[PDB]
Amino acid sequence: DKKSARIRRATRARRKLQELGATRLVVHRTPRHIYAQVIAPNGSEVLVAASTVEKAIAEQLKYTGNKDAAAAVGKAVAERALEKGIKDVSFDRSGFQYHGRVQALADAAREAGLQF
Amino acid sequence: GIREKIKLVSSAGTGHFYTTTKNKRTKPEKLELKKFDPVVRQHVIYKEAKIK
Amino acid sequence: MLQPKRTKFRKMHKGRNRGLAQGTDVSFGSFGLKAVGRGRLTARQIEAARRAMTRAVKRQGKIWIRVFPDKPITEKPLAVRMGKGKGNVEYWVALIQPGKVLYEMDGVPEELAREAFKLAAAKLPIKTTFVTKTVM
Amino acid sequence: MKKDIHPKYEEITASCSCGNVMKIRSTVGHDLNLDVCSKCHPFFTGKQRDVATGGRVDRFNKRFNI
Amino acid sequence: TRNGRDSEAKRLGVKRFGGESVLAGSIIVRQRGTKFHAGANVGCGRDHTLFAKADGKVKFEVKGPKNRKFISIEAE
Amino acid sequence: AKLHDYYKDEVVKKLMTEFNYNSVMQVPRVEKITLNMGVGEAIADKKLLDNAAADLAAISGQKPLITKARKSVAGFKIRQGYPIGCKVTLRGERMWEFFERLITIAVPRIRDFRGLSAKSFDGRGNYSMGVREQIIFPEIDYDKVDRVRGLDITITTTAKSDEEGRALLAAFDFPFR
RNA sequence: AAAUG
RNA sequence: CGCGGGGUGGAGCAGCCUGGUAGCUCGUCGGGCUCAUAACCCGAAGGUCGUCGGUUCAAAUCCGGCCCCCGCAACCA
RNA sequence: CGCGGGGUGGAGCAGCCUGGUAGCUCGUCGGGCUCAUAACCCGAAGGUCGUCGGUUCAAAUCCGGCCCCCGCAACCA
RNA sequence: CGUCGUAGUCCGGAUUGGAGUCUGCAACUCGACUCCAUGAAGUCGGAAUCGCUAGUAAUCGUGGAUCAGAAUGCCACGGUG
RNA sequence: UGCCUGGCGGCCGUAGCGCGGUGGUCCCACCUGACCCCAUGCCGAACUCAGAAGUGAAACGCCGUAGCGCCGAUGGUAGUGUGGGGUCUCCCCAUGCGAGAGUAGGGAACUGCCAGGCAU
RNA sequence: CCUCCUAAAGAGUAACGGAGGAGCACGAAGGUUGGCUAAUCCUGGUCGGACAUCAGGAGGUUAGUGCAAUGGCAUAAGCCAGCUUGACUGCGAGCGUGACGGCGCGAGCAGGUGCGAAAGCAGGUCAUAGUGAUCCGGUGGUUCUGAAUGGAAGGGCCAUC
RNA sequence: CCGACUUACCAACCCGAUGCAAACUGCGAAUACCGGAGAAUGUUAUCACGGGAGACACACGGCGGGUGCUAACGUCCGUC
Ligand SMILES: [Mg+2]
Ligand SMILES: [Mg+2]
Ligand SMILES: [Mg+2]
Ligand SMILES: [Mg+2]
Ligand SMILES: [Mg+2]
Ligand SMILES: [Mg+2]
Ligand SMILES: [Mg+2]
Ligand SMILES: [Mg+2]
Ligand SMILES: [Mg+2]
Ligand SMILES: [Mg+2]
Ligand SMILES: [Mg+2]
Ligand SMILES: [Mg+2]
Ligand SMILES: [Mg+2]
Ligand SMILES: [Mg+2]
Ligand SMILES: [Mg+2]
Ligand SMILES: [Mg+2]
Ligand SMILES: [Mg+2]
Ligand SMILES: [Mg+2]
Ligand SMILES: [Mg+2]
Ligand SMILES: [Mg+2]
Ligand SMILES: [Mg+2]
Ligand SMILES: [Mg+2]
Ligand SMILES: [Mg+2]
Ligand SMILES: [Mg+2]
Ligand SMILES: [Mg+2]
Ligand SMILES: [Mg+2]
Ligand SMILES: [Mg+2]
Ligand SMILES: [Mg+2]
Ligand SMILES: [Mg+2]
Ligand SMILES: [Zn+2]
Fold it and tell me: GO molecular function of the protein, one example (chain C)?
């Protein structure tokens, strides 16, 4: 019902991205956690992935489902991408409103050096 | 064919004008649109005028 | 006289009447009158046949009319030349292919049913045959 | 909720004939004085007497005595 | 009669079929709706006319949950 | 909020005792209370609708939405998108407060009140009722009002069965029959 | 102004 | 399109005719009067005075654009 | 057979003119007038708009079919 | 003397529900009257039409006959006028 | 490595419904609160943020189960290209192609990449 | 002129063959960003009834598309809201369709713009009707031309009636 | 006033079974058509450009049809 709606919201942009042939940064937010993964244009494989579910990121933070945490995740993924040589991406906000935590993560990524 | 044709003239001072249709009965007020003046090469305001 | 209540279209193309029929078996009744010949039964004809058979069966046992005159046939008025659009719908036909169970009947002895069908048959334009309920 | 579009909503004291004191949030503004409340209302007490079907035989007996 | 009218034929349909090597911009399908959908390296026009966005071979395929005909161009 | 507090400790407990529920989340709760004024007389003149809206606002501390015709019907002489009714949806603390008002004050003020309909539940928990007079609420002043009007209250709950909903309402000392 | 029984 | 003239209570016409100013013919109601419909009087409801802006103390009255009705000649591929 | 026009209470007419609205004259009914009737005066009622379908939210009204009427045209050898 | 202050009202009383009283063998159809409740229509009436010239019209009450009981009718009587 | 969970795909019903059961350490979901970021043509319902007392009730996931959906042969039938024939509105023969429907049956998906939890 | 069928599964294909529409509309009904999902039915609910408005379930696009028909449409092309003029100017590889006149689709490039955080999208509208060649004239722009020369008139070129 | 109820009555929705459709399709051929590769054969048979035309009344037969009466040496298309 809700998840389905979110998927519906997301999919138009996703299709467009696919038809561009873009290496997309896919974010996923839950009330408790935030997930980020850079996915190749083929769609079948991911390059780098960072989340608050990971023990390295979680141990540093106070609470995992907050704006600061999101920012941290964004930075982390971006650094990984840089290391892997992934510079240019497209932000797949995945049905979520570009606002608050998502937005924060994106901005952090931008700050780190991901070109989007 | 109740929709009369009108001539949007540039505020830039150039003789350039676009042309278009407008239903004058439902819309008495003048049409203003920011359109590209190809002579100045800028997006300028184009106020409505009579086709004459 | 059977005729469609409503129609999608008032007139219809001539078409062709080739192939074998689909309503081939005695489904509802015990006995049937299967069309051997190819042709087209009008609504009138069908009605006549029904009248013939009901009387024969003396309002005893059920009759089904498996065919329906759903195709309108146009006739151009007399002394009118060949142009000027399609003629008006005069009568309605069911196109009949060989194998068509036309009528079905139950609640009757077999001989009587046969007799009834024979009576009916003379009213119809196509050559026909008596058939029975078959297991499988 | 939205800042300006809504009517004023503040806690008021709703006095009653019961002696019951009821602090409630309302759009009234001033202090409220009630006639009846849920505890007061004759639902449990009234509705038995309020129907009053009775009987004719008893009435007959009462007034004539034979 | 009230019947003698019919419009000029629009010459629609698939113009370039499967395996047919085309130049970019070549119209693959003229159609009314999206009877065929634009896949990889195929653009959709304003009248839903599918055209090649790259040089290569036409590749018709059935894709997606709605089982729709997608035309892609594969590069040679 | 008092009634919410009551629910939190007592009503839930009562429900558990009665239906023998496995989960505490399995218990019914009142999701929303929806107030509506259908105002057909608004097509003749706009001000009546406004007045109705104001009344609604006075009744329940929220500013009402002005609902519009889903489809045009000639039988009532209305076109699509005609401002025909007004509606308030109450949720949370405000809703609770409204509920408290309704039972502790407003229902008692109903003229010739001999109970509420027990067989009025839609079949899946959600209760509905309607008042003939808006003056039963102490928010509306008797002298100020020009036109007599009413409204429908719709108590929507999480209850799967109507019986459960009924039970819940009883647990909140709802009048019934 | 005003026909008839 | 160019030019001229008009938009006046429910209708048409005066008041424009160089600002200081809502009358005419009916229409409607009510009253008096008649056998009365009427004739006739008295009394009243009924007009961003095409629309808007400007000059000015003061405009329907002057002017400018704009809208509509009419007339005018004019060519009209 | 073709092209038009129509069917609206008892009757004869309107409206249909760009869809939402039922009007006029006579008649009918109840009073009053006269000894009574007529005329006259007052007050009322009365219409699924030939019929059946269609489309707009909605049809007397627009479109189509069918029934009935009224015109016209139904020709050259 | 006080009150109501132009409202469908402290106007108006119809109608209905309940409780009664009396007359009478007997008050269902079908009496009058009382009490409590209830509180229609009606804001001076279309065409038309009636009475009255003085203690008259208008208005206010009172009595009698007929009568077990049962008058806004009838026949009378006075007041104001 | 094995099971479980989350994300992104491929695939597009042998994958979908239905009925029955099941899971909360983690995850996911509902959830608690909202002065603030932001939000409601009213409403913290949704969107959003700050959170973690409670529960898996709903949802979601998993396991089972032929009430359906779905897939589905072989054979036959229809049609039909070419040639030939007849009783020629339709047929038949030779030769090639060969359905649709139905039947036997299958069938409660399969699978890739990354991440987390618990195990060995 | 458009849609369907006739039309024989590419295109096309006739008849006084069978059916229907157009001679527009819209400064938003265009652009974009963000969000949303329909018809109908049942049950409950003041006035309120077969039919307004409010709930909830069933239902699953049977609805919608500014209008005919066909093909499309949930990624919605359907329905809301914010901000706006890309209903841009110059071009245009390459195609499609026409005997031709023509008509149509078009990625990308230059300039300049709008929406979006960004990727991106935007050269009118879901698409297919809504239209008229040439001549002759009318208006605006343009030093292109200018009959001895300077001007001008007239002509041309671009826009447009 | 809510109505109580039966009886050779017509009957929407839904379920089971039966057909029909040029303007129905949850299916779907044969042919045909478009494109690529290979072989033999064919007087280049193909395309382009230029000189010259004629023709634009067709007829019947076969197969697929519209119209007509599944009439016509009828009529109008498609195809050989
Ligand atoms: Mg068949
Ligand atoms: Mg007449
Ligand atoms: Mg009219
Ligand atoms: Mg008389
Ligand atoms: Mg009407
Ligand atoms: Mg009254
Ligand atoms: Mg006496
Ligand atoms: Mg569960
Ligand atoms: Mg086979
Ligand atoms: Mg098969
Ligand atoms: Mg399953
Ligand atoms: Mg074709
Ligand atoms: Mg073909
Ligand atoms: Mg969108
Ligand atoms: Mg749009
Ligand atoms: Mg549109
Ligand atoms: Mg369109
Ligand atoms: Mg000429
Ligand atoms: Mg010179
Ligand atoms: Mg077909
Ligand atoms: Mg010729
Ligand atoms: Mg010829
Ligand atoms: Mg020929
Ligand atoms: Mg033939
Ligand atoms: Mg011969
Ligand atoms: Mg022939
Ligand atoms: Mg011939
Ligand atoms: Mg023929
Ligand atoms: Mg031939
Ligand atoms: Zn109290």
Answer: structural constituent of ribosome
Å resolution of this model?
3.2
CA proximity to A102, closest of A48, A30, A40: A30
Going from the C-alpha of C28 to that of each of C65, F8, F111, the distances in angstroms are 10, 66, 67
| Number of domains present in the structure of chain F | 1
Instruction: Name the minimum distance, in Å, from the CA of F39 to any CA of chain D.
Output: 21
State the nearest Cα–Cα gap between E33 and chain C, in angstroms: 25
Name the structure determination technique: cryo-EM
Question: Packing angle between helix A67-84 and helix A100-112, nearest 10 degrees?
Answer: 30
Region at E36 (left for phi over 0; alpha for psi -120 to 50; beta for the rest): beta
Distance A22 CA to J60 C1' (A): 112
Asked if the Cβ of residue F81 lies within 7 A of any atom of strand I, the reply is no
- Which of E23, E20, E27, E75 lies closest to E49, judged by CA? E27
Amino acid C124 CA to nucleotide K39 C1' distance, rounded Å = 78
Q: How many angstroms separate the alpha carbon of residue C9 from the centre of ligand 1?
A: 19
Give the gap in angstroms from C-alpha F36 to the nearest C-alpha of chain D: 17
**Which domains are seen in chain C, by residue range?**
21-136 (3.90.1170.10)
Q: Which domain holds residue D32?
A: 1-41
In the sheet with B17-22, reading across from the earlier edge strand, the strands are B17-22, B4-10, B42-50, B32-37
**For residues A34 and A73, is the Cβ–Cβ distance under 8 A?**
yes
What are the φ and ψ backbone dihedral angles of C34, each rounded to 5 degrees? -90, 130
* E30 part of a folded domain: yes
Residue of E nearest to C83 (CA): E1
Q: Is the CB of D59 under 7 A from strand J?
A: yes
- State the residue for tokens 């005595």: D65
Q: Which nucleotide is nearest to A14 (CA to C1')?
A: L75
Please report the number of interchain residue pairs, chain C to chain E, with beta-carbon separation below 8 angstroms.
3
Q: Report the CATH number that the domain containing residue F97 is assigned in CATH.
A: 3.30.1440.10
Q: What is the dihedral of CA F90, F96, F100, F103, to 10 degrees?
A: 60
| Cβ atoms of F1 and F96 closer than 8 Å | yes
CA of D35 to the centre of ligand 9 (A): 89
Distances (CA, A) of C104 to C30, C51, C99: 7, 14, 13
| Cβ neighbours for A63, distance < 8 A, ≥ 6 positions apart | A69
